[PDB]
Amino acid sequence: SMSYTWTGALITPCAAEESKLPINALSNSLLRHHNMVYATTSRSAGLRQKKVTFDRLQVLDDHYRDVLKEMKAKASTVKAKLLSVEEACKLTPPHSAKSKFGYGAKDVRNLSSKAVNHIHSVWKDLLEDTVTPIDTTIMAKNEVFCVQRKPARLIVFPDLGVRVCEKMALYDVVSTLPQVVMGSSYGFQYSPGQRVEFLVNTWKSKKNPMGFSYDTRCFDSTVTENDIRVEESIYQCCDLAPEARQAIKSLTERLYIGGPLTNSKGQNCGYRRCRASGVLTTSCGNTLTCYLKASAACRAAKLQDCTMLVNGDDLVVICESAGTQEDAASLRVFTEAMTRYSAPPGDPPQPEYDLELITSCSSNVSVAHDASGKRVYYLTRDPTTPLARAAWETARHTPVNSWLGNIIMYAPTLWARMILMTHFFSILLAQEQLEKALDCQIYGACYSIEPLDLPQIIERLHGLSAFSLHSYSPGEINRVASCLRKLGVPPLRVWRHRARSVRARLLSQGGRAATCGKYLFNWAVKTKLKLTPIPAASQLDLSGWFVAGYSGGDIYH
Ligand SMILES: CC(C)[C@H]1C(O)=C(C2=NS(=O)(=O)c3ccccc32)C(=O)N1Cc1ccccc1
């Protein structure tokens, strides 16, 4: 069937939208070529609508149903609880979309009478009605990129009251079941340091390793009613409370398999018969369905010793090579199986033979050397987009600061350290907002971080290595230098002078600020410190961090 049907009505913005890079006094110090940077807006939503709209066909063979059986047995060992209205309420981001029924996220966060009353009524309605499609809002995502100029991505989400209800019914399921179903292949359990460790160990565990990523053409749109009904029969495998089973059935019939689409004005835009991007189960479903299709497609293409690594739609496979030309041939069969399963590719998969040449979760493995000369494997990426987004957030305050999320996840990298750390810690010194908590997104969940806890966080997710890394790979050094050339970013020399200034200004503050300069910027000095393990790092409660993915799922910690 068609993934979408369209009435003709436009996808409208909520507030004001800027497509070109905003400029302040601090912009040029980071980036010179400003017309290379742009953000997607609801202006381009019509191109995306075309790209997401297509007929899906599905052919389900025995390999599909074999893998599904296996998944179901594992899923049936799961016991999940109903979350109380209040517990579910506290998982709402403070900046999450307001209800059409006269309340907002903070009303939900403080547990106001109006909101909780309404949520209980939506829950009741979920139990007593398993048929009526639930209204969703269709919105274009505003996201910053550097030119090659992409269209806006879409977001489809239900009302805040329904979102809290999904939480009551399914928060426990989406958090625990995926790791139980897919084990080592569930990506969202790993921190950066564990992701590199798992990748490298897998690679070397093969006699002759072959790795590939699979770019699916718009995953969400390819998800069918079959896939959504199938993933529900997976959730139902869990030992659930009778109310949960009804709510999961109900949310599946009425909301997950599809429903009517409404712009931010309140106008009917059409109908969805594919994955909604902004529901609680978006990350988990995508991870389940992708694992399913891909698992079976490996069997169809007779790939041997497959270790898959799934994070939603994003998939990477490491296997035993059959030889370059047979690896190529096997991937053509894998693609054929995936296409048959309604997961056709965008750019076709290619077989790779250097771990560093494989991009998974927008990242590649790479090698650097710590203080003692030890080979340290770390994850990195082309820094273009993070730096473009950092240029936008230099001039426009955003609910989720993507630079901080980057500094957290890419802390051991050359570009995060010498540019991202230096620039924003300078920004925060100038504003005196170092003790001010900032929000970022890790695995889809929104986290509230205080900048001064960064060395403690970095030690915990990467090890003390992340502060000592030098002698980066020439390929990595080039790629960074190539990106900085393109963007018009100052050279390494400039950033060293700024970091020396940042560090010295942090040292004067004493305490957590001094600890910041010491650890984050020891790279910028000639007479470097030997960095000790920070004692106040075992203190940190990093629970919720690497448990599951929640992209579009409207989750807060
Ligand atoms: C952007 C940063 C914060 C982080 C992330 O949240 C994601 C990430 N967030 S997400 O839940 O939207 C998602 C879905 C699928 C695949 C990845 C992701 C990611 O890829 N990251 C990059 C990354 C770096 C090192 C190790 C693993 C991932």
From Swiss-Prot:
The modification Phosphoserine is found at residues 29, 42. It comes from the Viruses. The chain holds residues 2420 to 2981 of 3010 of the full protein. Its cofactor is Mg(2+). Changing residue 313 to E/H/N: Complete loss of RdRp activity. It is found in: Host cytoplasm; Host endoplasmic reticulum membrane. Mg(2+) 2 binds at residues 215, 313-314. Changing residue 281 to V: Almost complete loss of RdRp activity. Homooligomer. Interacts with non-structural protein 5A. Interacts with host VAPB. Interacts with host PRK2/PKN2. Interacts with host HNRNPA1 and SEPT6; these interactions facilitate the viral replication. Part of the replication complex composed of NS2, NS3, NS4A, NS4B, NS5A and the RNA-directed RNA polymerase embedded in an ER-derived membranous web. Changing residue 282 to K: Complete loss of RdRp activity. Activity is up-regulated by PRK2/PKN2-mediated phosphorylation. This is RNA-directed RNA polymerase. It catalyses: RNA(n) + a ribonucleoside 5'-triphosphate = RNA(n+1) + diphosphate. It is a single-pass type IV membrane protein.
